[PDB]
Every structure is written in structure tokens, then in C-alpha cells.
Paper text:
In the case of the opportunistic pathogen Pseudomonas aeruginosa, which causes lethal airway infections in cystic fibrosis and immunocompromised patients, the formation of biofilms plays an important role in antibiotic resistance and disease progression. Biofilm formation is mediated in part by the galactose-specific lectin LecA (PA-IL) and the fucose-specific lectin LecB (PA-IIL), as evidenced by studies with deletion mutants and the partial inhibitory effect of simple fucose and galactose derivatives in vitro and in vivo.[5a, 6] Understanding the glycoconjugate–lectin interaction is a key feature in developing potent biofilm inhibitors. Herein we report the first case of P. aeruginosa biofilm inhibition with a multivalent ligand targeting the galactose-specific lectin LecA, using the related β-phenylgalactosyl peptide dendrimer GalAG2. The structures of the lectin–ligand complexes were investigated to gain insight into the molecular basis of glycopeptide dendrimer–lectin interactions.
To probe the effect of the sugar-dendrimer linker on binding, carboxypropyl β-thiogalactoside (GalB) was also introduced as the last building block in solid-phase peptide synthesis to provide dendrimers GalA/BG1 and GalA/BG2, and the linear peptides GalA/BG0. In the structure of the GalBG0–LecA complex, solely the galactosyl group and the thioethyl part of its linker are well-resolved. Interestingly, the linker moiety points perpendicularly away from the protein surface in GalBG0, thus indicating impaired surface contacts of its tripeptide moiety with LecA. Considering that the number of sugars and the peptidic scaffold are the same in both series, the presence of the phenyl group in GalA dendrimers led to a remarkable enhancement in affinity compared with the thiogalactoside GalB dendrimers. The presence of the aromatic β-phenyl aglycone in the GalA series caused an additional affinity increase, as indicated by the ratios KdGalBG0/KdGalAG0=12, KdGalBG1/KdGalAG1=4, KdGalBG2/KdGalAG2=4 (MIC values: MICGalBG0/MICGalAG0=32, MICGalBG1/MICGalAG1=21, MICGalBG2/MICGalAG2=160).
Author numbering:
A (entry chain A), B (entry chain B): 1 to 121
Write the structure that this text describes.
């Protein structure tokens, strides 16, 4: 299991100790407050009122928590995943990333606290 | 395990099928959008900018997801709990509740989708 902070301004993302392997079932819970620029802050689902202006994940709002597994594209995490299994052929290290537009992470702030565990399978 | 919706206007709370027993470890993941009255909506952590005007749970923001276990007082849930154990002497059915001021639930809208499972222990 892994617990750590994911900084909103960390464009490369936060690498975890979790290596997702075929057949694995995992659970993620994410909490906290972060911003993609404004003085306001949002939770791990991001800002539902803000337009997508080139986000690294088009399937979640700006400011949402997303992830990559090995060399996958971005996958929405939001507040978390419950006893979740990955798509076929998706495997490898889990990296957590704040959803923002490439090159615009410098004015971000805050972070999410995240737990990941592997479940019975 | 249990999956269901918790309506923001449900003042009595949503009873789940989970009976928390001594020693149990549980995980909860909550997602979605709801409001305590304004046109805007907030996620399961509620509205960090809104003052507490008599919330059923003073340890969470207005519009946050909270719970009671048996005859316990309210306990924050927010986006979820990861492999969590209850305080001593807390046991019974888990009821999930939107955090608002008593008697002011009538103008609430939206809901959270919540999963609860018991973990290995
Ligand atoms: C202008 C609105 S705020 C704007 O939103 C962008 C993403 O869409 C970037 O994250 C920014 O850095 C932020 O200033
Ligand atoms: C006051 C601004 S909105 C106000 O906030 C409340 C709780 O603090 C109640 O939920 C009311 O229903 C709501 O209209
Ligand atoms: Ca930004
Ligand atoms: Ca209300």
C-alpha cells in the first residue's frame, strides 16, 4: 500500500510504490484542496465550471486527480476508485497527476493526500 | 458491501446494509455533486468557504458527506475512508448523511454515489 501527497504544481506527477499487475484489484481514496491558478480551491473532482483548455485528461475536470499506469494514457481518479480493475493490457507503476494544461502548472497550489491499496483477488 | 445514493435533501440520512462491528476495518469511497441551496454544486468535502451555522457535523464543511454508526454522533466521511477503524464502543448500522443545518434540507439538491466495503482484519 502507498500513502503520499500529490502536489498540484507537480507536472510530471507523483510516482507511487504501486506497480499495477494483471488481475490486480485496487482501491484509491483521495482527499484535500488544490488550485490550478485561482485563489479558490477545489477537491479531487476539480472544478466543474471551468472549460477544458487542453487538459492532460479530457475525461475529468480541471483540477481533478488523474493517474497513469505504466505507459497508459490518463485515467480519471477523482475522489477515488473502489475495488477497481484496469483495462486489458494496462500495467505498470501508478503515477498520480493533477489535471491541468501542459505548461501551466507553475501557478498551481495545494495538494491531495492519497491512499492506494491492493484488494483481495 | 454496499453501493447506493445519498440524496442531499435526505435529512434522516440514507441507511446502508453495513453493520459496523467491533474490530471491523472499512473503506468508503464517495463521489458526485450536490448543493445545500445555491445553484453551484460541491463534492463530498462540501463548501470550504461557507460558515458553520449549525451543521449536524461541526468537524466537516457544509455539504460534506458524514455518517453515524449506530447511536454515535456524526463522523466526517468526505471523499471516503481508507481501511478505517471506528472509535472504541462505536458500532451498529452505518447511516450516511449530507451535512447541513437541521430544518434546512428542503432546498438541497443532488446526491453522492457511495461504496462501502469491509476490509480484511
Ligand atoms: C484563465 C482561467 S484560470 C487558468 O486555467 C488554465 C487551465 O484551463 C491554467 O491552469 C491556468 O494556469 C489558469 O491560470
Ligand atoms: C446562507 C447561504 S445558503 C444557506 O446555507 C444553509 C446552511 O448554512 C442552509 O443550507 C440553507 O438552506 C441555505 O440556503
Ligand atoms: Ca495552472
Ligand atoms: Ca439547505
Amino acid at each position: 500500500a502507498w500513502k503520499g501527497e500529490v502536489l498540484a504544481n507537480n507536472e510530471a506527477g507523483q510516482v507511487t510504490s504501486i506497480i499495477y499487475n494483471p488481475g490486480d484489484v485496487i482501491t484509491i481514496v483521495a482527499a484535500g484542496w488544490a488550485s490550478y491558478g485561482p485563489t479558490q480551491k477545489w477537491g479531487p473532482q476539480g472544478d466543474r465550471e471551468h472549460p477544458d483548455q487542453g487538459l492532460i485528461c479530457h475525461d475529468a475536470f480541471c483540477g481533478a486527480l488523474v493517474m497513469k499506469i505504466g505507459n497508459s494514457g490518463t485515467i480519471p481518479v477523482n475522489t477515488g476508485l473502489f475495488r477497481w480493475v484496469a483495462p486489458n493490457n494496462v500495467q505498470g507503476a501508478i503515477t498520480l497527476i493533477y489535471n491541468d494544461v501542459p505548461g501551466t502548472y507553475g501557478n498551481n497550489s495545494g495538494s491531495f493526500s492519497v491512499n492506494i491499496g491492493k484488494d483481495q483477488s
